[PDB]
Design a protein around this ligand. Structure first.
Ligand code: HEM
Ligand code: HEM
Ligand code: HEM
Ligand code: HEM
Ligand SMILES: *Cc1ccc(CON(O)O)o1
Ligand SMILES: *Cc1ccc(CON(O)O)o1
Lengths: 141, 146, 141, 146
């Protein structure tokens, strides 16, 4: 569960992303594709090359979904309801990959937010991405 | 890494009793029931709407026969699983786009099917040998991914 | 989330287990120690040989916790709260191990429930043990 | 299964900029903060009551220097990680009782710390190289478990 201190830490750190949402989302995906090539099995229909419009556009959708979740930390199941339907019923991404993307989002934030990525904020962000992943896999079966 | 001689012997002894066709149909069917997101790879297979429909689906039974057939063949080459499955590894990556986590899920369902079918004879030592085998096959099928 | 059908399947299967629950708990632990030797790092104080009375006594406790979970399947976080405390803050078992014991509990049940362990009941039991595992790790951080 | 020549060069080049004592204390401190169940081995280390207390704890920092010192030495043997870490593997299993998942958590924390420390220089390809390294070290430290 996200404590009130977790929620404060996540809102502050993610608020600093701001207009860099699409950029950081795309970078997280590229980090995942290179570090964890099995995740590419879900994107055989994308140009995965660096700077591709498809990865940039998907990076932005992922990041805006995270902004929605941060903005609604108190009721993420309802805020992400359509998105959990989509992954459960259509995309059907194996749940193990959510940990891989979450790790790569954390690395991206660490590499871009040096002042904000304290040990306590690191922990809170890790819990938050795990909670998002739990919501997104909650209807799989 | 690597099976012991007593584990290899346990694997070979149990497999002599396995009807590969029937166990393969049961394992693939249970994979699609227990972890239904795995149905994403079988869109053309027809009715998968209920457990009974999955288990009775002839295309599920036929594919399970082929999958566990190739598994069975690999049991003759337990010291060289990477080389034995290299061609299917590239196939599952480049052509089928199958996340290798599915191989690990199938491995665990297969272990459950063997326990269910053989009962007391599927002893904790026999299971441990099969766990090494299914992990080894999954690692071999994952090895040519890029 | 456990559906009504899941709860029905779990109660039916664990009811058939009946008085053998403690024996099956010890068997599942034995299966885990042989199949996944890293789990033995949590029991340096145990004799883990086959038939060990320490494994048998621990197996009875595990099984009783699961019986109590089944009896409170709609109120499981509170039923298991003391065990969530114990695992989070004293035993500190890494969360990855709960999936290994869950698998071995499923294997043990399959080996003892020829009639009951249908594909549907298999699916319900897997969801139930994942739910127990989630509750047991819910206070880790 | 390994690093390419350019990936080995990239690992070596970045690591030549690392203060091993500093990064080691940071990585072990962060491990105990982010994954606090890892504190189970360090009840003798004193105050671990807050994140600042963990990060500032001199016994935490001391152990971080020792762990990452051995990690750093192992980077000279990227083609023999299992051999290089074999005796430490037996020790962590037989005497220390350290679940090898701890090694993988530490590897993840280390990657995060490198990203934090080096910023944009920790590019996606450099990360991919270091992910192979920390996975290989963790696999090597786990290989003699029994
Ligand atoms: C933090 C975790 C995740 C978030 C917030 C997220 C969010 C999203 C969003 C917002 C979309 C687009 C929805 C739409 O356009 O209607 C999407 C689609 C998609 N996601 Fe997820 N996702 C996550 C995890 C994952 C993971 C781990 C994978 C696979 C490794 C994945 C694979 C996909 C795919 C293949 C699509 C379809 C892309 C396309 O064809 O445009 N997602 N996701
Ligand atoms: C022990 C593990 C496995 C083995 C040995 C195996 C082997 C095979 C073999 C022999 C084929 C036939 C291909 C040909 O003749 O060209 C095949 C096809 C295929 N496999 Fe695998 N397989 C395994 C696991 C899986 C799993 C777990 C999945 C997905 C959940 C999967 C998905 C597929 C698909 C989608 C095809 C193509 C089916 C079609 O023709 O529509 N495989 N596999
Ligand atoms: C379904 C999952 C689990 C359940 C229901 C469960 C339940 C229990 C119970 C009831 C106890 C006894 C508490 C007491 O005596 O006050 C216990 C203790 C313990 N558990 Fe868990 N447990 C589970 C998973 C695990 C796993 C996966 C591990 C490690 C691999 C583990 C390691 C331990 C240890 C080391 C003890 C202390 C045993 C002793 O020293 O007597 N448990 N657990
Ligand atoms: C890159 C990964 C790691 C390396 C290379 C490493 C290396 C070492 C070395 C060189 C020692 C000293 C051995 C001796 O005195 O003979 C040691 C001890 C120890 N390690 Fe590991 N370690 C790693 C990860 C971990 C992790 C993640 C944990 C627990 C969370 C851990 C727990 C311990 C403990 C408890 C000791 C005993 C320390 C003492 O007695 O003061 N290690 N390790
Ligand atoms: C909110 C929440 C769910 C689980 C946890 C602890 O983190 N560990 O992965 O279990 O916090
Ligand atoms: C009750 C519940 C939580 C998650 C799920 C689906 O299982 N998937 O593995 O996530 O059900």
């Amino acid at each position: 569960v996200l404590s009130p201190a977790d929620k404060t830490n996540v809102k502050a750190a993610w608020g600093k992303v701001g207009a860099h949402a699409g950029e950081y989302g795309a970078e997280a995906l590229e980090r995942m594709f290179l570090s964890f090539p099995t995740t590419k099995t879900y994107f055989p229909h994308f140009d995965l090359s660096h700077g591709s419009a498809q990865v940039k556009g998907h990076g932005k959708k992922v990041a805006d979904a995270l902004t929605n979740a941060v903005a609604h930390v108190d009721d993420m199941p309802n805020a992400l309801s359509a998105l959990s339907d989509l992954h459960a019923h259509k995309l059907r991404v194996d749940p193990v990959n959510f940990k891989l993307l979450s790790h790569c989002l954390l690395v991206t934030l660490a590499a871009h937010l040096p002042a904000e990525f304290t040990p306590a904020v690191h922990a809170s962000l890790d819990k938050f991405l795990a909670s998002v992943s739990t919501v997104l896999t909650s209807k799989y079966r | 890494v690597h099976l012991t001689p007593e584990e290899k012997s346990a694997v070979t002894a149990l497999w002599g009793k396995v009807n590969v066709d029937e166990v393969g149909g049961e394992a693939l069917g249970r994979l699609l029931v227990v972890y239904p997101w795995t149905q994403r790879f079988f869109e053309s297979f027809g009715d998968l709407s209920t457990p009974d429909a999955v288990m009775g689906n002839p295309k599920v039974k036929a594919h399970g026969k082929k999958v566990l057939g190739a598994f069975s063949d690999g049991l003759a080459h337990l010291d060289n699983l990477k080389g034995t499955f290299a061609t299917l590894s590239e196939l599952h990556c480049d052509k089928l786009h199958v996340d290798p986590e599915n191989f690990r899920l199938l491995g665990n369902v297969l272990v459950c099917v063997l326990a269910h079918h053989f009962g007391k004879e599927f002893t904790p030592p026999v299971q441990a040998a099969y766990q090494k085998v299914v992990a080894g096959v999954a690692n071999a099928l994952a090895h040519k991914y890029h």
